[PDB]
Amino acid sequence: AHALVDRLSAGEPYAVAFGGQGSAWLETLEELVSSAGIESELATLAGEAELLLEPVASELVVVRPIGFEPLQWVRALAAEEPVPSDKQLTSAAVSVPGVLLTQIAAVRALARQGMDLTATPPVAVAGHSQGVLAVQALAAKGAKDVELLALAQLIGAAGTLVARRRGITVLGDRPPMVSVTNADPERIYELLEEFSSDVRTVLPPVLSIRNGRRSVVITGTPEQLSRFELYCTQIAEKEEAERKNKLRGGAVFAPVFDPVQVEVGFHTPRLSDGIEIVGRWAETVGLDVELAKELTESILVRQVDWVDEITELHEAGARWILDLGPGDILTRLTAPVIRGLGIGIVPAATRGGQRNLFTVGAVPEVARPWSSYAPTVVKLPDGSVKLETKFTRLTGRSPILLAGM
């Protein structure tokens, strides 16, 4: 008896969200296996992973051997001794498929208890970065499940072959993925355009993710990103001399800059040679569906305008959003984005938020629709008009006062 699903059926609508790369997936996958009492799905998913690689008529010569049997690494990690380094596990080749498996296993978990109820109905299914993959075949029939993992195996593979990290330095530390805070999307692109003016077409930084109002993410070659890092520092310091003059228009900006743990540039032209190869990799497999070409471009080259997409499905008035992404990523990214517009969001595979899911009474978490506190008009016995607010209601007077002077 799941109230939300029961709500979902008669009452308020729902939307599925899938997280992308940079989710710290392995520790979630390790826990998900340990927290799993049902191995039934993992039997077929492991076999089809073995199968689908063999018939491949696509090039895929380098990829298949560097691919690893998922069942072995898990059982090893369950003996508590074996596991490769985080640097090896975070590489797109083995990471991208593993992230989806964590998400797919996260789908099954809820589907175990309540399936008759916990079956299909979202309004829409949306995804982030490589998360758009697992979105597609979840909306398709169940035989398409590995096709995600199959395409993910292909996505991270070509992306790795085409472009991979050639250097890293403890300071910052410097990745292909960079994030700046507090600064306008226009201002960030300005400094971006200011710096990109000085560099060749081969290594420009570009805006990848716009996470919110003043929070963005710019990406490119780690070295060139480190150069953009220099200009923002100089401006920060020159504006410091401004702030200490005690002037507001003449005040320093207080942004927050710091890199990310992501190993390789995504949504950049540096992955452009990867699209083609990936496309052929799908058609040489039984993966044929017409969106394999569109997903790749969205993931590899085309940027992700995120806030606007999940908001669009949100402005459709769908009250609920779940995220089956590893750890939980994009569940909390979306929350202050929407905040008080009526949306509320439970991380999926999180025990606290799942406690809501499985009960009749603990379900209805619905974040406050600010319009709920919107002022109203009041009449009185002598017939005075009163503008109603949380202030007026208490005091019984107009919501205006002459402050102590």
Partner: protein
């Protein structure tokens, strides 16, 4: 691919109930020939005659795979070059092996060589003052300088010349010496004796300087390096062949280690600028290495040759010495003002 063998029994001699076919050596060769070359590369030299490598092209993804196969971060290491001099060994590998047997081996040697008994002694890359670069094509020549036998077995030093196709000049010289353990000869005789040195005209002497304390993991499986390098030897892959050869296990490629310790010397004393700095490297394999191995390397600054710093490297897994390495490195580039 299948390998066949044959036995013969004469029980008149009870202590020798089994005596097995003398065609074994020639029979073993035909098996290796099918697997190794598959008649894919073909030139037909006798051991003395030059072994030619037709044409070789370096893709940017072959740069990445090798630099990704061996990586160093925790020590502030930043690999930079178009082609690491370690990448030379991948080009010259399939040609060198062809010289391991011959009529000159038929004359003075029994031609008894277990391939499982093959032991790599030393490997070195000497530069002609040219360094490898981007897309320009390479063509390699391999020659056997000598064929020697030792108290511990048969040794075949192999000289290798790497040339840029488009330009048509010799860029580098690669040196390999292999040890088969069962043979004796009148060709070249050595008891304990072999020697090699990296030497230069103008030299300066220095004092021992500790540079870096290195921590290097060995790969989980040896197949990834086997694919890139072109070394298909079942010793490093198949457990049945490794056990048959009487080995501790699926031994890590000594060649991977060679690029492993090098990549550190490349980035550490070499600093964020390795490319024009290391003009040569030599590597000696002291002991065998199993996968999943935590190995500690230490490079020191010893002396100076031709304005290039010499750097000595020692390797230890616990108490055991593993690799002895030495490299010629140019100093961090200097700009003078008066």
């Amino acid at each position: 691919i299948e390998i066949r063998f044959t036995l013969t029994d004469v029980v008149r001699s009870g202590g020798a109930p089994i005596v097995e076919v003398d065609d074994a050596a020639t029979a073993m060769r035909a098996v290796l020939a099918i697997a190794a070359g598959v008649e894919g590369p073909e030139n037909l030299p006798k051991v003395v005659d030059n072994t030619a490598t037709v044409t070789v092209d370096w893709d940017p993804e072959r740069v990445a795979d090798h630099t990704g196969v061996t990586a160093t971060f925790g020590a502030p290491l930043a690999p930079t070059l178009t082609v690491v001099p370690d990448a030379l060994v991948g080009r010259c590998w399939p040609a060198v092996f062809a010289a391991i047997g011959s009529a000159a081996t038929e004359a003075g040697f029994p031609v008894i060589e277990g391939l499982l008994s093959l032991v790599h002694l030393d490997h070195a890359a000497r530069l002609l003052a040219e360094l490898p670069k981007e897309p320009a094509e390479f063509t390699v020549t391999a020659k056997a300088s000598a064929a020697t036998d030792t108290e511990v077995g048969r040794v075949v030093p192999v000289s290798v010349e790497v040339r840029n196709a488009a330009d048509g000049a010799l860029l580098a010289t690669l040196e390999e010496r292999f040890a088969i353990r069962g043979r004796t000869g009148a060709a070249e005789l050595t008891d304990p004796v072999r020697a090699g040195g990296a030497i230069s005209d103008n030299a300066t002497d220095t004092p021992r300087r500790r540079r870096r304390d290195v921590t290097v993991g060995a790969p989980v499986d040896m197949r990834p390096f086997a694919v890139v390098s072109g070394d298909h030897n079942p010793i490093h892959t198949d457990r049945a062949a490794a056990l048959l050869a009487g080995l501790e296990g699926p031994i890590v490629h000594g060649m991977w280690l060679s690029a492993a310790a090098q990549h550190v010397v490349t980035a550490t004393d070499g600093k964020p600028v390795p490319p024009a700095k290391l003009i040569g490297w030599t590597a000696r394999f002291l002991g065998m290495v199993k996968p999943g191995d935590q190995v500690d390397f230490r490079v020191d600054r010893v002396g100076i040759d031709v304005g290039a710093e010499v750097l000595e490297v020692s390797a230890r897994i616990g108490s055991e010495l593993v690799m002895a390495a030495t490299a010629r490195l140019a100093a961090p580039k200097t700009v003078y003002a008066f």
